[PDB]
Design a protein that fits this description.
Largest interface: A-B, 30 and 20 residues
Protein name (chains A, D): Capsid protein
Subcellular location (chains A, D): Virion
Shape of chain A: globular
Distance between the termini of chain A: 58 Å
Number of strands of chain A: 34
Oligomer: part of a larger assembly
Helix content of chain A: under 10%
Family (chains A, D): Belongs to the parvoviridae capsid protein family.
Keywords (chains A, D): Capsid protein, T=1 icosahedral capsid protein, Virion
Strand content of chain A: 25-35%
GO molecular function, one term (chains A, D): structural molecule activity
Largest sheet of chain A: 8 strands, mixed
Number of domains of chain A: 1
Number of helices of chain A: 1
Chain lengths: 516, 103, 103, 516
């Protein structure tokens, strides 16, 4: 339309309408001109003594919008309203809007650096709707819409790794290059706006409740089982049985089993002595792939990293966030006091404890001459009639992940939590259209001098979520997420005296309970 | 139309539809003011010991669009898709657009 | 029908029609009379020092058609045309015909 | 249908209906089982001291019908009726039929070799309508329907050469294999028949007339030209002209030029001394292709190999047939007495003589010090305003040739005469379906023992030809092809005392004349 008319309005809200809730968020973004308008091939060799660190890829001059964190859509208080009242939820639709664009030209003649706005410049924008480009959004990386609405953010630069050859920096004949200018995009001048809608594919509700019963003790403690059990042999070797009594859960027959587990190492937070001067890496859990060794946090779903009322944590089975945002490439050594360490202790009635052995079993064949022997195991995968709880979602965590296209997968639920999607919300890429400097003669060699500039604008995301109403018959009152602080020095989830947003705790999702 | 509205969009693509394929290319061009707005009569004598090199002509202050190279319309990969599967091809139509001008 | 009339024709082909491809193969088979018309009970004990080799079963006087190999339906060149251009494929239907018998 | 009913009838005929003539021919063919049912890769190195002889290819077990000789459709007498009365002709349609098939099984137990017929065996037949296979039909090779209708012929074996590497027997990565069982074919038992129709594409009429005027003497011999010509310089160097007089054809201005010529060597037939003990090959006309040297008879169109009333022949610009059919691979040294040497002397008024120089031209620049010099040339290609006559068609010669698919050609008229076609009458292939011998056990290795057998049947070809009516105003009588023999010892174009068909002369096509 025009220069003196606004292309959209500010919307931040939450509208609860029974079975649905609609969240809206608007933020102000700024977009730098990345790479100075060109593609570069980026690469690395073996860094920090690990060739799993090697890669080969491309950085592009595009930036993208990333809103795959819950705090980008939920306020602390609406999150509390959700986890204290519902049993589950899932995303239904998405609507995005980019508007009020402003391109600024920057000129640094004689160290004066003046910023003027360029009314005729454009930004290009497109969404990759067929998933033809490497999807980098759901991998726990930075650059999402901020938690707090008044914050202004920088869009991150799009880049991707393709195939490297033999754990070195070199490409292979299969490494691909994707040119993003090879997709159709819209061009927007200062009076233009971009709009985009999306519907999620039917996914299972997240389970925002904790189990009120232990999986191995579902039998009625008042009645005995009509099943018996082998309990020994007499002085001659003949077998003897005993009836499974009422409430002797250590012996009853079971119908269901706990989920898969792979033992992780346990460390003590706060009080609780640990081995001094250790170097985690050398002894962490790894998986090999293409000849290299990778750490695999947070480990696959089906375990619990903490046992309620204990300070031992299987740290690599844990999501660890920082209480605040950090600068790029920081190598500082943070301590427990700076972190937001999550705990999955409310799944312990169903998920095995990560730092303990998973059980034991027969190692030999007993005979008149050999005594029965058993041996414990450290890992155990899926068996039939197995049940576990998926990892929890936090307000500061990720909403979805793309399920990789390979044609074969098992139980597509991402290790970091959230929804696993075949076709997730498409990537939205954006860049400042290049504007050439003063060029006076002809050359077949591509132009390399540009006017420096950047853009800024507003972005609105509108998500509809479907809720699963809590339907309990528990008599006594439940546990609820509550604002409880002893002698607060500042309000949590609010700006402090400096104006910086504070958050002292990770807020999970399981407060309500249910009988198994 | 106006200063704060874009006059066109970016299109780069290849659409294969059986017997046809449609290629689209968008580029950003820059145009210098040539000759300082005037026509000049340019000429040469015998250069490098060859009078076939002699000429007489005119330079103008105009520039032109030239898209008479295959790589202006085909990506390496679409070119490969064409030469590994077809016995021939020929051009059928052309559409050109100049937009988002900035002096 | 009759002795001096052929009961079918020879079809070998590949017809690509966009989203589908239809392959046809004709072969000439010969069928021996197996076992001399009778069922036999065949069996084995532990062979090569492995009792996983033991079995008990039956041979019959029947023979069967087996077309569960890709090269029974694809020529080297059509196979190349498939693997250089498509992301996947799956079988949809099957039609079989036995004809021109001669005892 | 059935064993005791015939699948077709015998048709031999010629029906003249004004502007059209329809010929029908039926022959009896026999088909051997070639190669014993298998494909073989055939090849050769440098034979007879020439690597142009090297090749790489495949023989197949198929045979084919070839009716690309005029005598397969025309009797000597209908041919005479055509060349004495029409100015031209061209083929319009084709209809083929294969019927009355009989498969015979041959058993040679104890040297008795008995032939029985196998009522249940088949022959496979198909026509290559999309020209997907190497077309070998129009290349002057044997195996066509015979001249004489009572003759029984053997179908030839289909084979083809593909690409060899560096003039050696080895293939290249571009050499192709064509499996003929990979086309859809009909199967015919003794009661079945195959039918096939085809329409020729509009082609130019063959020109069956000789020119009644010489191309360089088209001016009226009674009037002078109003054009002048440079005739000399005076003692001072000034140029002088002379008017072109009436009937001085050596000087008139011309509008048109004779066709292209490449000098060929001339040899004397009958009376007329030649160089003794010569070895043609070493000095014949050649063209290089892929590093090898090939002889190229009959040379390209546009020349005349003989000058009327002379016994000098440019033998390599000539079509040489044998008076009778020969056995395969004969290395006998035939003499002029055994041949049917064609002559194109009736094109001499328009086509240059092949054994003479083509003309001459300026070699220098005259000045007061140098005298004008000229030099003759031996070859001259096409120039604008060039005219020539194509080679003639003979009764014992070829009707059509396939124009090679390359995307670029000039004046698609075959050197051997006939019609050049983009899409010629498709090849008709035929083979005896294999029948396995006694096989008692299973093997994954392909069956290699077959019952030996062969087939035979009738084939009818029906061609429609369009004629161009002769429309002359010549007053005096014309030359006609006539049965003229001084003291015949036998009738020509008839069976002799032995029963073998005789033919003592090639019958061309130009008897009628026309003014240029």
């Amino acid at each position: 339309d025009g220069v003196g008319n606004a292309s959209g309005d500010w919307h931040c809200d939450s509208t609860w309408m029974g079975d649905r809730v609609v969240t809206k968020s608007t933020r102000t973004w700024v977009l730098p001109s990345y790479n100075n308008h060109q593609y570069r091939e980026i690469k690395s060799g073996s860094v920090d003594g690990s060739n799993a660190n090697a890669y080969f890829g491309y950085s592009t001059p595009w930036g993208y919008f990333d809103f795959n964190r819950f705090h980008s859509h939920w306020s602390p208080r609406d999150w509390q309203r959700l986890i204290n009242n519902y049993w589950g939820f899932r995303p239904r639709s998405l609507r995005v809007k980019i508007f009020n664009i402003q391109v600024k030209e920057v000129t640094v003649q004689d160290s004066t650096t003046t910023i003027a706005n360029n009314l005729t410049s454009t930004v290009q924008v497109f969404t990759d709707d067929d998933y033809q480009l490497p999807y980098v959004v759901g991998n726990g990386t930075e650059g999402c819409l901020p938690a707090f609405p008044p914050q202004v953010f920088t869009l991150p630069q799009y880049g991707y790794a393709t195939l490297n050859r033999d754990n070195t920096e070199n490409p292979t004949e299969r490494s691909s290059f994707f040119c993003l200018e090879y997709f159709p995009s819209k061009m927007l001048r200062t009076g233009n706006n971009f709009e985009f809608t999306y519907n999620f594919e039917e996914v299972p509700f997240h389970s925002s409740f904790a189990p009120s019963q232990n999986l191995f003790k579902l039998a009625n403690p008042l009645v005995d089982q009509y099943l018996y059990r082998f309990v020994s042999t007499n002085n001659t070797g003949g077998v003897q049985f005993n009836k499974n009594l009422a409430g002797r859960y250590a012996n009853t027959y079971k119908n269901w089993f706990p989920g898969p587990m792979g033992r992780t190492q346990g460390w003590n937070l706060g009080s609780g002595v640990n081995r001094a001067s250790v170097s985690a890496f050398a002894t962490t859990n790894r998986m090999e792939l293409e000849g290299a060794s990778y750490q695999v946090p947070p480990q696959p779903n089906g375990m619990t990293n903490n046992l309620q009322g204990s300070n031992t944590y299987a740290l690599e089975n844990t999501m660890i966030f920082n209480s605040q945002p950090a600068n790029p490439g920081t190598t500082a050594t943070y301590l427990e006091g700076n972190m937001l360490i999550t705990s999955e202790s409310e799944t312990q009635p169903v998920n095995r404890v990560a730092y303990n052995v998973g059980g034991q079993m027969a190692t030999n064949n007993q005979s008149s001459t050999t005594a029965p022997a058993t041996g414990t195991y450290n890992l155990q995968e899926i068996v039939p009639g197995s049940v576990w709880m998926e990892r929890d979602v936090y307000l500061q965590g990720p909403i979805w992940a793309k399920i990789p296209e390979t044609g074969a997968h098992f139980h597509p639920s991402p290790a970091m939590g959230g929804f696993g999607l075949k076709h997730p919300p498409p990537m939205m890429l954006i860049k400042n259209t290049p504007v050439p400097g003063n060029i006076t003669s002809f050359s077949d060699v591509p132009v390399s001098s540009f006017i420096t500039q950047y853009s800024t604008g507003q972005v609105t995301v509108e998500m509809e979520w479907e809720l699963k109403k809590e339907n309990s018959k528990r008599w006594n009152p439940e546990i609820q997420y509550t604002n409880n602080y002893n002698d607060p020095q500042f309000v949590d989830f609010a700006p402090d005296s400096t104006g910086e947003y504070r958050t002292t705790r990770p807020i999970g999702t399981r407060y309500l309970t249910r009988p198994l």
